[PDB]
Write a protein that binds this DNA or RNA. Structure first.
Ligand SMILES: [Zn+2]
Length: 198
RNA sequence: AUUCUGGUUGAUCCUGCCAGAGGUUACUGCUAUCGGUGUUCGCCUAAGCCAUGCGAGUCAUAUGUUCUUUGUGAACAUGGCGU
């Protein structure tokens, strides 16, 4: 594998080992073959195989919009989807796109009933809205599980979040918007302004 | 577990209901060994109609009469209480 950008040269030199220092570098993480060495423990799951099509003069174009979400079950998770003529190349392109979009989300115990403080649930209440699908990340008591959907359980188990209550608004049929709104909520987890004394 | 899934599209987002998925209640198809707990089994139609037995009777230290199995034993009556 030939690194191409400055981040690839830095990771091949050994200066950047984990993705946190790469994000601290501030450069664009464009090569899919950098995060695999930075995080060899990356895991992902295909979230749907919804087969799109398209109209032509003679026949009908066919593609696959398979989406795969990537996390590490510790506090890092990312979103990524891709399409191509075959399910294999489509899912592999989605895996390439997802690993470039991994982010670090800080976690704790902000539940009204839970009082542990050790990171097992969302730090506080946040929202994720991709399309009309919206998800609120209300904290949950420890040792309880995710009070969300099956794809929500997959995405939040990839992201490392353990116990959460949620709620869904709008047309929840689109699994792609469900994954993207969960991503938006997790990104709003670590963007709200916290007190300096906390 | 403060839960989603399919359906309108050539394909998407979506409003929108439809249907899926869990209780409980009533009834019921199929079907079947047993015990425990108690505060269920003609309510939902007919508060329709009823054969049969029965469900409130008791009082000898209230009065009165005949027996005896001689004893707060029974039968009758007036009467008290209760129904
Ligand atoms: Zn806790």
């Amino acid at each position: 594998w030939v690194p191409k950008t400055r981040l690839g040269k830095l990771v091949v030199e050994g200066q950047v080992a984990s993705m946190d220092e790469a994000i601290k570098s501030g450069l664009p993480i464009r090569e899919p073959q950098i995060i695999d060495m930075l995080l060899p423990d990356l895991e992902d799951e295909v979230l749907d195989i919804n087969m799109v099509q398209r109209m032509t003069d003679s026949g009908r174009r066919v593609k696959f919009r398979a989406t795969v979400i990537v996390g590490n079950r510790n506090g890092y998770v990312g979103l990524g989807q891709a399409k191509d003529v075959q399910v294999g190349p489509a899912i592999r392109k989605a895996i390439d796109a997802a690993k470039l979009n991994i982010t670090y989300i800080r976690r704790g115990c902000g539940s009204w009933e839970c009082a542990c403080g050790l990171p097992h649930t969302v730090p506080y209440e946040v929202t994720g809205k991709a399309g009309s699908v919206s998800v609120t990340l209300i904290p949950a008591p420890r040792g309880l599980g995710i009070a969300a959907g099956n794809t929500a359980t997959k995405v939040l188990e990839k992201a490392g979040i353990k116990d959460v209550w949620t709620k869904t608004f709008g047309t929840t049929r689109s699994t792609l918007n469900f994954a993207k709104a969960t991503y938006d909520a997790l990104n709003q987890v670590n963007v709200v302004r916290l007190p300096v004394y906390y």
